[PDB]
Amino acid sequence: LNRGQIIGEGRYGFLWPGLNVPLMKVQTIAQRSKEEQEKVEADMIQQREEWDRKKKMKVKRERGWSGNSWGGISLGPPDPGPCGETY
Amino acid sequence: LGISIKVHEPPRKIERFTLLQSVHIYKKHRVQYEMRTLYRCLELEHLTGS
Amino acid sequence: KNRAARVRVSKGDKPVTYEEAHAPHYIAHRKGWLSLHTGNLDGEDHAAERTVEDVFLRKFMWGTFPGCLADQLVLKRRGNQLEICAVVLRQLSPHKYYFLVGYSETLLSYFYKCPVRLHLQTVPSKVVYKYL
Amino acid sequence: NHHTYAELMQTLRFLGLYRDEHQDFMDEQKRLKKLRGK
Amino acid sequence: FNDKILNEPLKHSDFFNVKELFSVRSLFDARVHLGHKAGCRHRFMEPYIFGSRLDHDIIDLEQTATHLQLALNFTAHMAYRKGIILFISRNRQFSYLIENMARDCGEYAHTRYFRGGMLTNARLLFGPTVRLPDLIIFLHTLNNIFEPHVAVRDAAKMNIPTVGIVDTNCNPCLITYPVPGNDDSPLAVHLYCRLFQTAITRAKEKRQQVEALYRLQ
RNA sequence: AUAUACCGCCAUCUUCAGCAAACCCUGAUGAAGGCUACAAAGUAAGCGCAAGUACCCACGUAAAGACGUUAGGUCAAGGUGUAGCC
Ligand SMILES: [Mg+2]
Ligand SMILES: [Mg+2]
Ligand SMILES: [Mg+2]
Ligand SMILES: [Mg+2]
Ligand SMILES: [Mg+2]
Ligand SMILES: [Zn+2]
């Protein structure tokens, strides 16, 4: 939920010198236009939807003997020894 | 600064008051909070106003 | 089974700090009161306003310094003066910090008619007391 | 007061200084209700 | 590359000349040949049992001499290769002597309660990097309870070789060098600890001599 | 509207002492089990009992009491999923 909301972002589209702009160079309290906020808002909704469709991305699970059954599922090559002995 | 003082400690007061543990029934199960106040008396004898 | 400030022991991957590893039967024993004001002593007035004011600061500070508080806060009061001890992770840029410092310093002072002084302390990670 | 305590935080969310998580959660779940229902 | 002396006694036979340390006359007065009652006899020890006189096993000492001559060769080689020789017993009669015979040489003993998973779970019982022992001498392969010792299973498990004084009661099948005979007489274990000290104390000084010579060359 | 979606707070067995991650072993490598100090396979961080702490002490009384059971109690402390009305 709290991943794309940067701490510069506001619904009332405003700008600050310390954050949300490239730092200290413009050093005045500016706001966006309503017609500039209309693009950043729909862009953020689009990127949320991008992250949602990446969440709804079907993984290619290999098939051991069946679907929905741990048949010939190959797990990883096993864990090392804590002093060597890679496998 | 040269002031003839004396220090003693008056008795301490605890105000222990009670309230319900649950939100509903089980009135027979309370929980009690106490507030301590510790005093210190700091007499200062024979000094100028300033 | 009382459930007040207990974090419930579940699995060995729960890292907790010192203040929340302890149940509320330890507050004078192994902990300390995080807010420090004179309102609770007896007899003395004006208790309620300062507790509501203090619960406002903890909701305010956990939002405006987002995702970077390690612990809860400490509020100290010395008369017409109140200071805030806060431990903050070293994740955000110090420029971004120093903006939100003075913004808080003047906004909360103009809100509560009192010269506040928020004094932070950096930490790399959240300090772990008990791996439950 | 509870009006100055509320309108200040609402306008500070709008300006972008206060990040109220409960209002972050609530209207997003309202959007998820309005995507299907409503 | 010092790998000449790592293989030079391997080409020899009786490199340390250990056959001078004992004789079958030296075992007979040590009363190695005595055994338990014939009803108290393990089935797998009848290869080494000579016969039975008056319901008493006598161990075939010309077959024990062959076993012990190779067992002493094995422990002398394992002590010349600067390895770890561990002395396991559970008899409680000679546990003072056995810790003495480990402390006289530079090796280790264990004559008390064998904690469970001492050799198999060493990575967790001790720190996670431990040189596990690589030769185990069983002086009494039974417990105080007349059952085979758990370490003769666990050292066979951990792929480390065991020599051991097998008696007429006890299982020889995991003992990689069984040394048949008595173990329950004090003269037996006094000859055994002296023999197992003398076969390894020769080996340590023979390690020192040949390595000092191949520093001289 | 649902405490049979929940958080939050507690009741209870609790006038209990256990619960247990990560290993190791035995059961022909089955569900499982792991006890014998003149000791035969158990080792165990962590939590709890315990110890400390409060009141008048070292005692007592409080406090504490895990993991679980009873889908125990509460959408009416507050918030909140879902369903509903506008
Ligand atoms: Mg299928
Ligand atoms: Mg209770
Ligand atoms: Mg009680
Ligand atoms: Mg206790
Ligand atoms: Mg019910
Ligand atoms: Zn014997």
XYZ file of C-alpha atoms (C1' of nucleotides) and ligand atoms in Angstrom:
616
model
C 0.000 0.000 0.000
C 2.661 2.429 1.142
C 5.211 1.950 -1.651
C 4.562 4.548 -4.368
C 3.396 7.327 -2.077
C 6.554 9.353 -1.787
C 6.669 11.921 1.019
C 6.674 14.731 -1.511
C 3.311 13.708 -2.958
C 0.108 15.545 -2.176
C -3.382 15.639 -3.644
C -3.190 19.410 -3.623
C -0.329 19.387 -6.066
C 2.378 21.454 -4.440
C 6.157 21.558 -4.424
C 8.670 22.133 -1.637
C 12.355 23.054 -1.771
C 13.730 20.368 0.554
C 12.096 17.334 -1.047
C 9.838 16.572 -4.079
C 12.067 18.729 -6.332
C 15.734 18.488 -7.322
C 17.266 19.895 -4.177
C 17.654 23.658 -3.613
C 17.843 24.679 -7.299
C 13.509 26.005 -7.639
C 13.803 27.540 -4.154
C 10.230 28.854 -3.960
C 6.912 27.317 -2.936
C 5.413 26.383 -6.294
C 2.310 24.401 -7.141
C 1.399 22.401 -10.192
C -1.526 23.384 -12.297
C -4.720 21.376 -12.039
C -3.969 20.445 -15.660
C -0.524 19.230 -14.652
C -1.842 17.231 -11.688
C -4.325 15.507 -14.035
C -1.415 13.693 -15.718
C 0.640 12.753 -12.634
C -2.467 11.400 -10.889
C -3.505 9.138 -13.782
C 0.145 8.111 -14.175
C 0.276 6.980 -10.535
C -2.982 5.061 -10.958
C -1.458 3.470 -14.070
C 1.666 2.428 -12.169
C -0.432 0.961 -9.360
C -2.296 -1.012 -12.040
C 1.061 -2.084 -13.483
C 2.081 -3.427 -10.068
C -1.327 -5.109 -9.770
C -0.987 -6.920 -13.098
C 2.533 -7.962 -12.113
C 0.944 -9.348 -8.939
C -1.558 -11.173 -11.186
C 1.205 -12.739 -13.271
C 0.927 -16.510 -13.585
C 4.180 -18.289 -12.705
C 5.309 -21.220 -14.840
C 5.219 -24.023 -12.300
C 6.809 -27.185 -13.658
C 4.815 -30.397 -13.561
C 5.873 -33.359 -11.470
C 3.591 -36.333 -12.281
C 0.444 -34.169 -11.982
C -0.803 -30.743 -11.335
C -1.639 -30.034 -7.681
C 0.538 -32.924 -6.507
C 4.149 -32.967 -5.316
C 5.115 -35.752 -7.643
C 8.491 -35.578 -9.307
C 8.981 -31.981 -8.212
C 12.706 -31.301 -8.174
C 13.676 -29.088 -5.276
C 16.961 -27.240 -5.222
C 20.333 -28.852 -4.808
C 20.702 -29.079 -1.058
C 21.973 -26.597 1.453
C 25.730 -26.353 2.041
C 27.604 -27.473 5.062
C 28.469 -24.466 7.228
C 32.169 -25.225 6.624
C 32.110 -26.027 2.896
C 30.758 -29.184 1.207
C 28.809 -27.683 -1.659
C 26.341 -30.063 -3.278
C 25.865 30.912 47.681
C 25.790 30.631 51.494
C 22.175 30.001 52.570
C 21.264 28.192 55.794
C 19.030 25.393 54.531
C 17.676 22.089 55.757
C 16.315 19.140 53.798
C 13.802 16.558 54.886
C 11.303 14.409 53.040
C 7.570 14.512 53.821
C 5.479 11.321 53.579
C 4.696 9.935 50.163
C 1.178 9.673 48.811
C -0.118 7.009 46.457
C -3.541 7.415 44.873
C -4.594 3.898 43.901
C -7.721 3.712 41.756
C -9.490 0.868 40.012
C -11.145 0.107 36.644
C -12.527 -2.800 34.618
C -10.218 -5.238 32.888
C -12.527 -6.376 30.104
C -14.744 -4.265 27.904
C -17.977 -6.194 28.533
C -18.931 -8.485 31.452
C -16.306 -10.023 33.838
C -16.762 -7.268 36.367
C -15.201 -9.646 38.907
C -11.836 -9.102 37.159
C -10.481 -5.576 37.603
C -7.183 -3.835 37.081
C -5.790 -1.219 39.438
C -3.504 1.703 38.643
C -1.599 3.740 41.161
C -0.065 7.186 40.973
C 2.869 7.970 43.232
C 3.832 11.448 44.341
C 7.086 11.836 46.227
C 7.740 14.984 48.187
C 10.903 16.850 49.065
C 11.004 19.730 51.531
C 13.719 22.271 50.935
C 13.564 24.959 53.632
C 15.743 28.021 52.988
C 16.228 30.209 56.046
C 17.352 33.854 56.252
C 17.985 35.215 52.786
C 17.447 38.387 50.782
C 14.586 38.707 48.320
C 16.858 39.267 45.343
C -5.201 -14.445 29.223
C -4.344 -10.780 29.426
C -3.250 -9.186 26.183
C -2.354 -5.599 26.990
C 1.106 -4.692 25.716
C 2.189 -8.268 25.148
C 3.603 -9.020 21.787
C 2.630 -12.667 21.499
C 5.555 -15.066 21.170
C 4.933 -16.909 17.892
C 8.073 -17.678 15.862
C 11.792 -17.020 16.123
C 11.708 -14.355 13.408
C 10.011 -11.624 15.405
C 12.505 -8.863 16.182
C 11.277 -6.533 18.948
C 12.704 -3.444 20.605
C 13.075 -2.997 24.350
C 9.946 -0.951 24.992
C 7.569 -3.372 23.301
C 9.231 -6.542 24.561
C 7.906 -5.671 28.001
C 4.400 -6.068 29.325
C 2.665 -3.218 31.233
C 3.415 -4.790 34.603
C 6.990 -3.574 34.094
C 6.518 0.145 33.492
C 8.015 1.392 36.700
C 9.968 -1.840 36.961
C 11.810 -2.306 33.671
C 10.518 0.521 31.474
C 9.862 4.226 31.648
C 6.907 6.442 30.904
C 7.425 7.802 27.420
C 5.661 11.087 28.126
C 6.938 13.248 30.978
C 4.613 15.967 32.262
C 3.501 17.223 35.665
C -0.234 16.767 35.144
C -0.578 13.462 36.929
C 0.717 14.606 40.296
C -1.726 15.239 43.067
C -3.166 17.667 43.447
C -2.555 19.454 40.153
C -4.801 20.675 37.348
C -4.755 20.636 33.523
C -4.040 16.933 33.121
C -6.428 16.130 30.277
C -5.343 18.768 27.759
C -1.719 17.701 27.922
C -2.489 13.991 27.498
C -4.664 14.685 24.440
C -1.900 16.977 23.171
C 0.592 14.170 23.658
C -1.530 11.595 21.848
C -1.763 14.111 19.023
C 2.044 14.332 18.736
C 2.470 10.577 18.473
C -0.100 10.273 15.695
C 1.363 13.327 13.970
C 5.006 12.290 14.123
C 4.414 8.742 12.949
C 2.764 10.081 9.823
C 4.927 13.034 8.857
C 8.152 11.056 9.315
C 6.786 8.086 7.396
C 8.230 4.586 7.621
C 11.344 5.722 9.475
C 10.528 5.760 13.215
C 12.322 2.866 14.865
C 10.620 3.119 18.264
C 7.873 5.074 19.908
C 8.536 8.630 20.953
C 9.675 10.307 24.147
C 8.003 13.577 25.058
C 9.586 15.716 27.741
C 8.022 18.797 29.282
C 9.867 21.574 31.108
C 7.286 24.310 31.607
C 6.920 26.498 28.517
C 9.157 24.074 26.637
C 8.638 20.590 25.286
C 11.129 18.402 23.500
C 10.765 15.207 21.500
C 13.236 12.333 21.558
C 12.844 10.243 18.406
C 15.098 7.553 16.993
C 15.044 7.571 13.200
C 16.512 5.102 10.712
C 19.286 6.372 8.436
C 17.267 5.606 5.307
C 15.932 8.922 4.051
C 18.255 11.656 2.888
C 19.441 14.094 5.585
C 18.280 16.956 3.361
C 14.762 15.505 3.406
C 15.162 15.182 7.164
C 16.350 18.766 7.805
C 13.334 20.069 5.899
C 10.826 18.110 8.014
C 12.732 19.067 11.162
C 12.115 22.797 10.925
C 8.680 22.296 9.428
C 7.734 20.351 12.546
C 9.544 22.842 14.835
C 7.524 25.802 13.601
C 4.232 24.013 12.873
C 3.955 22.380 16.274
C 5.103 25.505 18.077
C 2.529 27.611 16.251
C -0.029 24.910 17.012
C 0.557 24.480 20.727
C 1.852 28.000 21.557
C 5.026 26.492 23.014
C 8.667 26.386 21.845
C 9.162 22.722 20.981
C 12.570 21.218 20.265
C 12.593 17.883 18.445
C 15.975 16.196 18.926
C 16.514 13.077 16.854
C 18.933 10.199 17.140
C 19.994 8.238 14.082
C 20.177 4.469 13.998
C 20.995 2.134 11.075
C 18.380 -0.511 11.843
C 15.681 -1.083 14.414
C 17.494 -2.208 17.562
C 16.494 -5.758 18.476
C 15.954 -6.922 22.051
C 14.190 -10.289 21.804
C 14.054 -12.614 18.850
C 10.775 -14.197 19.947
C -11.757 21.048 19.162
C -11.707 18.051 16.740
C -12.334 20.329 13.761
C -8.961 22.054 13.815
C -7.468 18.715 14.769
C -9.091 17.050 11.752
C -9.083 19.677 8.990
C -5.400 20.399 9.596
C -4.467 16.767 9.077
C -6.758 16.467 6.085
C -5.211 19.527 4.429
C -1.757 18.254 5.396
C -2.477 14.975 3.631
C -3.638 17.066 0.696
C -0.558 19.268 0.762
C 1.619 16.235 1.277
C 3.210 16.548 4.672
C 1.133 14.235 6.839
C 0.701 10.617 5.785
C -2.376 9.338 7.605
C -2.353 5.574 7.139
C -5.992 5.040 8.145
C -7.112 7.414 5.429
C -4.586 5.732 3.149
C -6.308 2.393 3.765
C -9.942 3.502 3.892
C -10.393 5.268 0.557
C -8.285 2.698 -1.271
C -10.633 -0.005 -0.012
C -13.492 2.286 -1.055
C -11.963 2.335 -4.540
C -11.869 -1.456 -4.503
C -15.535 -1.470 -3.542
C -16.255 0.942 -6.413
C -14.327 -1.180 -8.906
C -16.697 -4.147 -8.588
C -19.948 -3.246 -6.859
C -20.528 -0.111 -7.265
C 55.264 -31.183 -0.778
C 56.302 -33.317 2.195
C 54.321 -36.212 0.762
C 57.240 -38.644 0.801
C 56.879 -39.579 4.488
C 53.093 -39.604 4.124
C 53.491 -42.682 1.940
C 56.900 -44.104 2.909
C 55.761 -46.247 5.898
C 52.812 -47.359 3.790
C 55.228 -49.225 1.521
C 56.865 -50.869 4.538
C 55.416 -53.664 6.640
C 55.806 -53.253 10.415
C 57.456 -49.877 10.002
C 57.414 -49.031 13.712
C 58.542 -52.568 14.727
C 55.670 -53.135 17.125
C 55.956 -56.948 17.273
C 58.735 -56.592 19.849
C 56.331 -55.014 22.361
C 54.503 -58.245 23.199
C 54.286 -62.016 22.804
C 51.658 -64.683 23.358
C 53.601 -65.633 26.483
C 53.153 -61.994 27.508
C 49.395 -62.329 26.975
C 48.978 -65.666 28.739
C 50.356 -64.373 32.034
C 48.183 -61.320 31.468
C 45.202 -63.738 31.412
C 43.816 -62.443 28.135
C 42.671 -65.952 27.187
C 40.000 -66.215 29.906
C 36.356 -65.766 28.960
C 32.874 -65.739 30.418
C 30.562 -68.708 30.925
C 29.759 -70.620 27.730
C 26.097 -69.741 28.181
C 27.070 -66.054 28.176
C 28.653 -66.161 24.736
C 27.889 -64.066 21.668
C 27.385 -66.054 18.514
C 29.917 -64.099 16.463
C 32.881 -64.713 18.763
C 33.070 -68.463 18.192
C 35.509 -67.870 15.281
C 37.983 -66.611 17.898
C 36.969 -68.992 20.705
C 39.532 -71.787 20.917
C 37.331 -74.053 22.984
C 35.534 -74.269 26.286
C 36.951 -75.791 29.463
C 34.499 -76.357 32.333
C 31.866 -73.978 30.919
C 34.515 -71.305 30.306
C 35.608 -69.916 26.973
C 39.300 -69.733 26.145
C 40.178 -67.388 23.335
C 42.387 -68.700 20.511
C 45.453 -66.640 21.287
C 47.285 -67.426 18.083
C 44.361 -65.763 16.313
C 44.276 -62.887 18.799
C 47.972 -62.305 18.144
C 47.268 -61.772 14.448
C 44.402 -59.380 15.212
C 46.368 -57.401 17.773
C 49.446 -57.185 15.563
C 47.419 -55.467 12.854
C 45.499 -53.385 15.394
C 48.718 -52.048 16.855
C 49.959 -51.350 13.328
C 46.745 -49.424 12.637
C 46.877 -47.296 15.770
C 50.600 -46.686 15.318
C 49.981 -45.509 11.771
C 47.048 -43.376 12.958
C 49.257 -41.798 15.614
C 52.131 -41.274 13.209
C 49.759 -39.429 10.873
C 49.185 -36.931 13.767
C 45.579 -38.085 14.091
C 43.153 -38.059 16.995
C 43.014 -41.293 18.991
C 40.121 -41.444 21.460
C 39.852 -43.969 24.274
C 36.306 -45.089 25.078
C 35.442 -47.235 28.108
C 32.483 -47.857 30.425
C 33.775 -50.247 33.040
C 34.251 -47.898 36.069
C 36.951 -50.144 37.493
C 39.774 -48.785 35.375
C 38.406 -45.352 34.477
C 41.153 -43.780 36.564
C 43.815 -45.727 34.639
C 42.277 -44.904 31.274
C 42.260 -41.147 31.804
C 45.838 -41.612 33.047
C 46.811 -43.411 29.871
C 45.269 -40.694 27.743
C 47.033 -38.001 29.729
C 50.408 -39.739 29.613
C 50.334 -39.659 25.817
C 48.989 -36.734 23.826
C 45.562 -38.230 23.206
C 42.042 -38.196 24.602
C 39.764 -40.491 26.547
C 36.089 -40.740 27.384
C 35.087 -43.078 30.153
C 31.882 -41.548 31.463
C 28.282 -41.322 30.340
C 28.218 -41.131 26.573
C 25.978 -38.183 25.780
C 23.538 -38.871 22.983
C 24.789 -37.815 19.593
C 28.261 -36.952 20.748
C 29.882 -38.068 17.496
C 26.920 -37.669 15.143
C 25.686 -34.293 16.354
C 29.118 -32.755 16.981
C 28.366 -29.769 14.709
C 25.696 -28.679 17.182
C 27.049 -30.051 20.444
C 30.302 -28.156 20.000
C 31.120 -25.177 17.830
C 30.263 -25.729 14.172
C 33.900 -26.412 13.164
C 35.337 -29.392 15.065
C 37.937 -31.910 13.973
C 35.881 -35.037 14.585
C 37.936 -37.956 15.990
C 39.451 -40.328 13.462
C 40.384 -43.355 15.523
C 38.468 -44.838 18.418
C 39.939 -47.450 20.752
C 37.205 -49.295 22.590
C 38.648 -50.848 25.698
C 35.289 -52.164 26.881
C 32.754 -52.454 24.107
C 29.938 -53.085 26.572
C 28.297 -50.573 28.874
C 27.707 -51.176 32.519
C 24.516 -52.646 31.114
C 25.667 -55.663 29.158
C 24.556 -54.291 25.777
C 26.906 -53.234 22.970
C 28.192 -49.705 23.277
C 26.345 -47.025 21.366
C 29.581 -45.559 20.102
C 30.469 -48.745 18.210
C 27.384 -47.925 16.136
C 27.971 -44.184 16.032
C 31.638 -44.393 15.062
C 30.721 -46.900 12.386
C 28.065 -44.368 11.396
C 30.454 -41.430 11.209
C 32.845 -43.429 8.962
C 35.741 -43.466 11.428
C 37.641 -46.650 12.320
C 37.380 -48.468 15.620
C 39.792 -50.866 17.226
C 38.532 -52.649 20.270
C 38.971 -55.367 22.864
C 36.055 -57.629 21.970
C 35.097 -60.066 24.734
C 33.087 -63.292 24.615
C 29.902 -61.293 25.256
C 30.054 -58.527 22.723
C 29.296 -57.999 19.056
C 32.370 -57.804 16.774
C 30.545 -56.822 13.600
C 31.133 -53.097 13.661
C 34.519 -53.239 15.357
C 36.873 -52.646 12.447
C 39.801 -54.123 14.371
C 38.477 -56.591 16.928
C 41.084 -57.697 19.431
C 39.693 -60.819 21.082
C 40.402 -61.750 24.644
C 39.650 -60.828 28.223
C 39.011 -57.281 29.204
C 37.567 -57.798 32.666
C 40.746 -58.600 34.537
C 42.903 -55.721 35.803
C 46.068 -57.315 34.421
C 44.412 -57.416 30.993
C 43.609 -53.706 30.905
C 47.003 -52.853 32.424
C 48.725 -54.704 29.572
C 46.293 -53.179 27.079
C 46.788 -49.572 28.137
C 50.559 -50.022 28.250
C 50.535 -51.583 24.785
C 48.345 -48.856 23.366
C 50.601 -46.241 24.913
C 53.805 -47.823 23.684
C 52.477 -48.254 20.157
C 51.579 -44.575 19.882
C 54.466 -43.008 21.781
C 56.799 -44.686 19.311
C 54.718 -43.156 16.536
C 54.873 -39.562 17.774
C 58.650 -39.558 18.166
C 58.989 -41.376 14.851
C 56.974 -38.535 13.328
C 59.371 -36.051 14.907
C 62.539 -37.864 13.777
C 61.660 -38.331 10.102
C 60.231 -34.841 9.740
C 63.383 -33.342 11.279
C 65.461 -35.386 8.853
C 63.421 -34.195 5.889
C 63.949 -30.682 7.119
C 67.674 -31.511 7.150
C 67.457 -32.633 3.525
C -26.535 -7.760 9.508
C -22.679 -11.125 10.716
C -17.997 -11.891 17.719
C -18.806 -18.327 12.549
C -14.260 -12.701 8.874
C -11.397 -9.623 12.662
C -8.119 -6.186 15.484
C -8.685 -4.199 20.184
C -9.652 -6.165 25.617
C -10.535 -10.385 28.816
C -12.949 -14.837 30.994
C -11.633 -20.135 31.714
C -8.461 -24.841 32.743
C -4.544 -21.353 35.755
C -5.002 -23.179 43.377
C -1.288 -25.423 35.732
C 4.263 -26.289 34.303
C 4.787 -26.854 30.459
C 5.489 -25.244 25.172
C 8.983 -25.392 21.876
C 12.235 -23.531 16.691
C 17.029 -25.741 14.617
C 19.585 -30.641 14.969
C 20.721 -36.053 16.251
C 18.995 -41.084 17.070
C 15.631 -45.490 17.444
C 11.455 -47.733 15.104
C 13.769 -53.172 8.612
C 13.718 -44.859 7.545
C 5.177 -46.128 9.411
C 1.870 -42.984 12.495
C 5.357 -41.882 16.224
C 8.993 -42.289 20.456
C 13.538 -40.430 22.977
C 12.903 -42.231 30.443
C 17.006 -45.146 34.079
C 23.568 -40.586 37.901
C 26.770 -47.307 40.292
C 22.923 -43.961 33.895
C 21.129 -47.583 27.819
C 20.081 -41.170 22.857
C 19.204 -37.319 23.356
C 21.463 -31.822 22.608
C 18.783 -27.680 22.625
C 18.498 -21.275 21.880
C 13.483 -18.844 22.893
C 8.829 -18.293 25.895
C 6.419 -19.709 30.532
C 6.789 -21.660 35.889
C 11.139 -20.067 38.599
C 14.358 -15.887 40.188
C 14.138 -10.830 40.868
C 10.183 -6.554 41.760
C 5.752 -3.784 44.585
C 3.455 -3.441 49.695
C 5.548 -4.092 55.978
C 11.121 -8.262 55.281
C 13.777 -13.439 53.641
C 7.245 -14.671 54.613
C 2.507 -13.579 52.986
C -0.639 -10.864 49.628
C -0.911 -8.803 44.997
C 1.143 -8.709 40.252
C 2.495 -12.526 36.959
C 0.712 -17.495 34.356
C 3.196 -19.204 27.938
C 1.119 -22.667 24.021
C -3.542 -24.246 23.540
C -9.378 -25.533 24.795
C -14.556 -23.520 24.907
C -15.630 -20.722 16.569
C -16.462 -18.621 25.083
C -17.951 -12.620 25.475
C -18.230 -7.939 22.804
C -19.424 -5.116 15.230
C -23.067 -1.387 21.114
C -15.824 1.407 23.598
C -13.510 2.531 19.105
C -11.663 0.847 14.275
C -12.462 -2.616 10.494
C -13.441 -7.007 6.246
C -17.838 -8.613 3.803
C -23.147 -7.814 2.861
C -26.821 -3.834 3.035
C -29.472 1.444 3.049
C -28.820 6.435 1.156
Mg -4.292 -29.514 -13.079
Mg -6.831 -11.743 35.484
Mg -4.874 -12.350 40.321
Mg 6.962 -15.561 38.070
Mg -20.534 -17.991 19.887
Zn 34.370 -58.175 29.395
